[PDB]
Design a binder for this molecule. Structure first.
Ligand SMILES: [Mg+2]
Ligand SMILES: [Mg+2]
Length: 228
């Protein structure tokens, strides 16, 4: 695709999220860069308004799959880059087992040379002393996640499903079921993929000199499931 050519080098990234979970309002700003040649993302996020009412790890999937490494033989299946620079809408429902749900709507597009992810997140039906509002999740991430992608010809886009599992401080796990839909913003042709998945590994850390509430993310993502 034409859009693929925008990703051959390192690209700056900005992320801006506005959130409301059970009436608790918050905002997150992120900066970093992506290098799709290596499927590599480095991002630092800061919580900028009200006290973060949910654990950082539960926001990782919401806070730019255009930076996935698609192997050369799978390039014709990369919807995400093909929609650029005009971008795509990405919507999810994230269902936390035995707890509430996030509904997210994001637009991912270029603003000049910079790849931007603007997100609205709404969370409802969370339990007061559940794992999420109770802040009972460890600050870490389990690898790898498989993001299963299929074409949605009717909306000229894609759908995806996947499960993530967040470690609870007692040694148990909190399941998050994700359902995802992406549709192009522009009028150029986009690539409609054969079934495949993104193999993703995230690692969370803290900046020792940062006193604001924050998250540092290093992430590697590679498309797979189709043989050459
Ligand atoms: Mg700012
Ligand atoms: Mg109600």
């Amino acid at each position: 695709s034409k859009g693929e050519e925008l990703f051959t080098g390192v690209v700056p990234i900005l992320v801006e999220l506005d959130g409301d979970v059970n009436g608790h309002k918050f905002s997150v700003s992120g900066e970093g860069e992506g290098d799709a040649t290596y499927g590599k993302l480095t991002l630092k996020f800061i919580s900028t308004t009200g006290k973060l009412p949910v654990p950082w790890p539960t926001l990782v999937t919401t806070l730019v799959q255009c930076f996935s490494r698609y192997p050369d033989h799978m390039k014709r299946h990369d919807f995400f880059k093909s929609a650029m620079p005009e971008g795509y809408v990405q919507e999810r429902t994230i269902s936390f087992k035995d707890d509430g749900n996030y509904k997210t709507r994001a637009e991912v597009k270029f603003e000049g040379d910079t790849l931007v992810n603007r997100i609205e997140l709404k969370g409802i039906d969370f339990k007061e002393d559940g794992n999420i509002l109770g802040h009972k999740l460890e600050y870490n991430y389990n690898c790898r996640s498989n993001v299963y992608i299929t074409a949605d010809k009717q909306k000229n886009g894609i759908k995806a499903n996947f499960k993530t599992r967040h470690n609870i401080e007692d040694g148990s796990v909190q399941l998050a079921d994700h359902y995802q839909q992406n549709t192009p913003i522009g009028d150029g042709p986009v690539l409609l993929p054969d079934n495949h998945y993104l193999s993703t590994c995230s690692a969370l850390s803290k900046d020792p000199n940062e006193k604001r509430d924050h998250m540092v993310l290093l992430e590697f993502v590679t498309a797979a499931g189709i043989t050459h």
